[PDB]
Amino acid sequence: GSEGHRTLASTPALWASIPCPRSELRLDLVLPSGQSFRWREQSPAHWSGVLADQVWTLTQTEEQLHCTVYRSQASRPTPDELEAVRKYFQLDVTLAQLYHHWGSVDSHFQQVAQKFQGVRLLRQDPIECLFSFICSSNNNIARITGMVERLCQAFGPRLIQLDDVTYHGFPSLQALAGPEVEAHLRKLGLGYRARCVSASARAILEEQGGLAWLQQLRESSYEEAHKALCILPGVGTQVADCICLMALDKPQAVPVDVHMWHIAQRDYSWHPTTSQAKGPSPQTNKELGNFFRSLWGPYAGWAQAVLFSADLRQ
DNA sequence: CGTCCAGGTCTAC
DNA sequence: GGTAGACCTGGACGC
Ligand SMILES: CCOCCOCCS
Ligand SMILES: [Mg+2]
Ligand SMILES: [Mg+2]
């Protein structure tokens, strides 16, 4: 009871609650669906991971999101700590209101939304998001998830151990820019993305003026932010859109991968009309992103997250 | 066991 | 501009 990952049943006094209906949040549809790669369902309905530099376990009942933290004596999370959870889930954004809107303007969205409630966007750290999505390219979620864990294990600071799992914070730019990072990441199975991690960490610190440059894209425009990210090695349109949506507070950013292509054709009979290219291409991928913005409006990326997630499950 | 595929990015024509 | 091929890996899918 004192050791291992906590459950709600087994250590009741160490949990605290955040009011939040399952209609506003389904952990099981958000945490393994390729937004963040850093959460594991270590016991049934309990998700463990690192969030604002500490380890947490999260579980839900119909009206509550229950939260425990591992930091000192074992105790309930504090009000300030609980805030970090609220911010990470962006719980001020009311998902019932967005679903209504998207539902009204798109009857296909209405149909999928009935069976896939509580899919919202996490608000992620820019560095973690940048380097996770560099690992995402031409890859599947199961393998990306391992790549990311091994990366944090080798280069990130040791937080705490539960059972046989040692949690690590996400690596700094400095660690990722270090000597022989590529060769090390190649032995950890990252393949060609090993080079991209080293190169982007160095590009940021040595050519772009460091962490500040990345962080300040939050206050910049989607279009400025998206252009700025594309200069980095391993960061194309898609990876940049993932970062803008998931880390830089750009809700209108819509990543366009093979899933979204399939969704467009199957469920909207979409075809490009500004370019003569039949398939995925820079100009057809731009157009498809514009189609979804025009359809769903300024939170189109959030709508994308609902159908993307629902397409993973089918 | 050989292709094909997964939250693509690159350069080269 | 739209197009093709190279780059890691390891599960799923046939033949
Ligand atoms: C998909 C292969 O290209 C990845 C980005 O270019 C190489 C720099 S690390
Ligand atoms: Mg606690
Ligand atoms: Mg780039």
Sheet holding A46-51, edge to edge: A16-19, A64-70, A54-60, A46-51, A39-43
Residue of least CA–C1' distance to C10: A143
Residue A118 lies in a domain: no
Q: Which of A183, A79, A196 is nearest to A134 (CA)?
A: A196
A229, A250, A271 - which closes a domain: A250
In angstroms, the CA A301 to CA A296 distance is 9
Å between A147 CA and B7 C1'? 15
Residue linked to tokens 């099981």? A28
User: Residue A239, Cβ neighbours under 10 Å: how many?
Assistant: 24
Domain that holds residue A179: 125-250
Same domain? For A32 and A72 the reply is yes
In angstroms, the CA A108 to CA A166 distance is 43
Same domain? For A48 and A97 the reply is no
Q: DSSP of A167-230, one letter per residue?
A: EEPPPPHHHHTSTTHHHHHHHTT-TTHHHHHHHHHHHHHHTS-SHHHHHGGGTS-HHHHHHHHH
Same domain? For A74 and A142 the reply is no
Residue linked to tokens 């090390």? A184
**What's the token pair of residue A281?**
């291409």
Q: At what angle do helices A222-230 and A237-246 cross, to 10 degrees?
A: 130
Residue A157 contacts residue A169 (beta carbons within 8 Å): yes
Chain A window 222-251: residues with CB closer than 7 Å to nucleic chain B are 230, 232-240, 242
Q: With the C-alpha atoms ordered A46, A28, A194, A157, is the resulting torsion angle positive or negative? A: negative
**What's the token pair of residue A206?**
């040595």
Residue A120 lies in a domain: no
Same domain? For A77 and A107 the reply is no
In angstroms, the CA A106 to CA A187 distance is 47
Nucleotides of C under 7 A from a protein CB: 1-3, 7-10
**What's the token pair of residue A17?**
């609650």
Strand (E) or helix (H) holding A70:
strand A64-70
- Please name the residue whose Cα sits nearest to atom 9 of ligand 1: A196
Same domain? For A246 and A258 the reply is no
Those residues whose C-beta lies under 8 Å from the C-beta of residue A192, and which sit 6 or more positions away, are: none
Same domain? For A286 and A226 the reply is no
Same domain? For A107 and A73 the reply is no
Please give the angle made by the CA atoms of A262, A266 and A267, to the nearest 5 degrees: 110
**What's the token pair of residue A20?**
């939040």
Residue linked to tokens 């919202």? A120
A232, A250, A268 - which closes a domain: A250
Same domain? For A81 and A194 the reply is no
A74, A89, A104 - which closes a domain: A89
Q: Which of A139, A130, A137 is nearest to A243 (CA)?
A: A130
Same domain? For A263 and A224 the reply is no
Q: Which of A196, A233, A245 is nearest to A34 (CA)?
A: A245
In angstroms, the CA A21 to CA A19 distance is 7
CA A210 to chain CA mean position, Å? 22
Q: Which of A247, A265, A245, A263 is nearest to A255 (CA)?
A: A245
Q: How many domains does chain A have?
A: 3
Å between A298 CA and B4 C1'? 36
Q: Where do breaks (C to N over 2.5 Å) occur in chain A, by preceding residue number?
A: 71
In this structure, which ligand is nearest to the CA of A243?
3
User: Residue A101, Cβ neighbours under 10 Å: how many?
Assistant: 15
- In three-state form (DSSP H/G/I as H, E/B as E, the rest C), the secondary structure along A242-305 is HHHHHCCCCCCCCCCCHHHHHHHHHHHCCCCCCCCCCCCCHHHHHHHHHHHHHHHCCCHHHHHH
Residue A181 lies in a domain: yes
Count Cβ atoms within 10 A of the Cβ of residue A41 and give its class: 0-12 exposed, 13-18 middle, 19 or more buried.
middle
Residue A283 lies in a domain: yes
Same domain? For A84 and A198 the reply is no
Those residues whose C-beta lies under 8 Å from the C-beta of residue A140, and which sit 6 or more positions away, are: none
